Design a protein around this motif. Structure first.
Motif, PDB file in Angstrom:
ATOM      1  N   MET A  88       0.826  -1.200   0.000  1.00 39.01           N
ATOM      2  CA  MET A  88       0.000   0.000   0.000  1.00 39.01           C
ATOM      3  C   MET A  88       0.865   1.256   0.000  1.00 39.01           C
ATOM      4  O   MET A  88       1.734   1.425   0.857  1.00 39.01           O
ATOM      5  CB  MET A  88      -0.929   0.005   1.216  1.00 39.01           C
ATOM      6  CG  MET A  88      -1.699  -1.292   1.398  1.00 39.01           C
ATOM      7  SD  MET A  88      -2.665  -1.319   2.921  1.00 39.01           S
ATOM      8  CE  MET A  88      -4.327  -1.169   2.271  1.00 39.01           C
ATOM      9  N   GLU A 147       6.034   3.369  -0.680  1.00 46.58           N
ATOM     10  CA  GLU A 147       4.981   2.369  -0.538  1.00 46.58           C
ATOM     11  C   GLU A 147       5.384   1.294   0.467  1.00 46.58           C
ATOM     12  O   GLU A 147       6.558   0.943   0.579  1.00 46.58           O
ATOM     13  CB  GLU A 147       4.669   1.728  -1.891  1.00 46.58           C
ATOM     14  CG  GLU A 147       4.306   2.732  -2.972  1.00 46.58           C
ATOM     15  CD  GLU A 147       4.946   2.408  -4.308  1.00 46.58           C
ATOM     16  OE1 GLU A 147       4.440   1.503  -5.002  1.00 46.58           O
ATOM     17  OE2 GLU A 147       5.952   3.060  -4.658  1.00 46.58           O
ATOM     18  N   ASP A 197      -2.638   5.099   8.984  1.00 49.04           N
ATOM     19  CA  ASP A 197      -3.297   4.526   7.816  1.00 49.04           C
ATOM     20  C   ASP A 197      -4.561   5.307   7.467  1.00 49.04           C
ATOM     21  O   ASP A 197      -5.010   5.300   6.322  1.00 49.04           O
ATOM     22  CB  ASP A 197      -3.644   3.058   8.068  1.00 49.04           C
ATOM     23  CG  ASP A 197      -3.299   2.170   6.890  1.00 49.04           C
ATOM     24  OD1 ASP A 197      -4.127   1.305   6.535  1.00 49.04           O
ATOM     25  OD2 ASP A 197      -2.200   2.341   6.321  1.00 49.04           O
ATOM     26  N   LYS A 222      -2.900   7.582   5.393  1.00 47.37           N
ATOM     27  CA  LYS A 222      -1.773   7.012   4.664  1.00 47.37           C
ATOM     28  C   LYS A 222      -0.587   7.971   4.662  1.00 47.37           C
ATOM     29  O   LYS A 222      -0.040   8.298   3.607  1.00 47.37           O
ATOM     30  CB  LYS A 222      -2.182   6.687   3.226  1.00 47.37           C
ATOM     31  CG  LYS A 222      -3.463   5.876   3.127  1.00 47.37           C
ATOM     32  CD  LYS A 222      -4.648   6.752   2.759  1.00 47.37           C
ATOM     33  CE  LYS A 222      -5.766   5.939   2.121  1.00 47.37           C
ATOM     34  NZ  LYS A 222      -7.083   6.623   2.235  1.00 47.37           N
TER      35      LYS A 222
END
Length: 56
Positions: free
Chosen positions: A1, A19, A47, A50
């Motif tokens: 992610m 990432e 998260d 992010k």
């Protein structure tokens, strides 16, 4: 992610991205970058947006 870690020190600028698949993935991938300045700061895990917060 995909992720985006930000760095900011007392009088030092910072801004980058990277990432990561796991919480460690970013910690192991950053351990090689931190050597650039040789700092011992810490990185947070967010998260929800992010984005990782770091203070050099």
């Amino acid at each position: 992610m995909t992720f985006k870690a930000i760095i900011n020190g007392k009088t030092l600028k910072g801004e980058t991205t990277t990432e990561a698949v796991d919480a460690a993935t970013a910690e192991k991938v950053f351990k090689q970058y931190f050597n650039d300045n040789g700092l011992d700061g810490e990185w947070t895990y967010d998260d929800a947006t992010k984005t990782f917060t770091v203070t050099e």
